[PDB]
Amino acid sequence: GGTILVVTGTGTGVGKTVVCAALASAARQAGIDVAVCKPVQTGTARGDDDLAEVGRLAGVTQLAGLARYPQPMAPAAAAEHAGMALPARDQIVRLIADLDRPGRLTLVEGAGGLLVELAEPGVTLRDVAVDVAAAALVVVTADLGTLNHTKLTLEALAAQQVSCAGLVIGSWPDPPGLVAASNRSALARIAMVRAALPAGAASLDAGDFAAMSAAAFDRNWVAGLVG
Amino acid sequence: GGTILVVTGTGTGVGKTVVCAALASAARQAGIDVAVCKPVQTGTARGDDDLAEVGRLAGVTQLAGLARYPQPMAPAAAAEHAGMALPARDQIVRLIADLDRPGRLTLVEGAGGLLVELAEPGVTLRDVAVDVAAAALVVVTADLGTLNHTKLTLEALAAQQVSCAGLVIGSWPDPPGLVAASNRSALARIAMVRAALPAGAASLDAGDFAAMSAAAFDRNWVAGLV
């Protein structure tokens, strides 16, 4: 195959989609082929479409979804409110494996934080990660509380021997206050911090977002993701 | 000894202190003796002082603390900014074990979440809870994301064989809303929700607060704690 990364986060609203787009953008400019996959997508009735937003910021054309629920809730609840069911575990794995391909980087963005239920019964993105032998990239905030949430998430990853590919601070304020600056230093002691995306990046146009994306990550780390 | 309960939360700002006070008030109205220990308090320059709130709301007088850092940061950050270490692990565990006595409910309120650093070198409320054989009361919100954060916390609890005494929703909005109504049901699918405290209770005076607290917890559970 190729390389699969699940792109998880310490919670919902932390910047997973923007990180998916930025890493996708940076890997494309390195000549790497990129697919982004969004198996469970809630809140469509509010115009939430994470695949579309990755396409809008990054120009990614290989977008694969699967389940779509109208309400902006946890997938279990959004499905119950629509009269629908959750996908099965193997349905999600199949969607990912069909994208996987030598030389391709396949990013898999979850619904919210790592332990959210994606498929019956209580199947999470952690289980999906184990099935496809993927590593997890954890998107974190710079805000008060991020150290605990990060440690909890990493611990839950190691419970099932899912490797951590590093952290990404989804939104990095300019200028950074005392708490942000301190947290960035402390997060670096817990794991490799791969990038710190500037706040408001979704308002950068194609070229600016691509500029920001290449500068955000270490070139050698991005290139070493896929052989 | 008696019952030691550690009071943790899924994050910062979930209302641990109001839950400590509410649980305290309930237990006293069942005639139980309560102590509250807040080993480390931060944000004191702007007047953060969670033990005073417990005294006012619940009338607890055995109120125990070891360190106060002016900066409103996580304790180890607050310590570094001030130029001083955190307390030692021994101080925390022995202050708590010294509060503990037969007939008493001893609540231990952490800072932030379960894995935040509370003492040198890098010891957490979870370590403390292990050292004193306490179960953990998990304070949660009702907002989008509470499920992930709760499951994460309960998983960390279990990883070190710390028992979970339950969840309390620190703040129940009015009116609930679709997410909060569904979350209250969902949280109950992963652990015993012990109470949901009405939004704004923190601001009550002690008389009304005592009434709220009396009705917020199940009486048999409160009694069954000690």
Ligand SMILES: Nc1ccn([C@@H]2O[C@H](COP(=O)(O)OP(=O)(O)OP(=O)(O)O)[C@@H](O)[C@H]2O)c(=O)n1
């Ligand atoms: N460097 C960043 C990070 C985030 N955002 C904005 O902050 C919000 C949250 O980011 P998002 O990527 O959507 O967070 P997710 O973790 O993907 O939340 P969800 O669970 O809904 O997928 C979005 O409006 C996004 O445009 C931004 O402009 N610049």
Ligand SMILES: C[C@H](N)[C@@H](CCCCCC(=O)O)NC(=O)O
């Ligand atoms: C509606 C949000 N945007 C998100 C769902 C977040 C679920 C949070 C569940 C929880 O942990 O309580 N949907 C999504 O990322 O597709």
Ligand SMILES: [Mg+2]
């Ligand atoms: Mg997203």
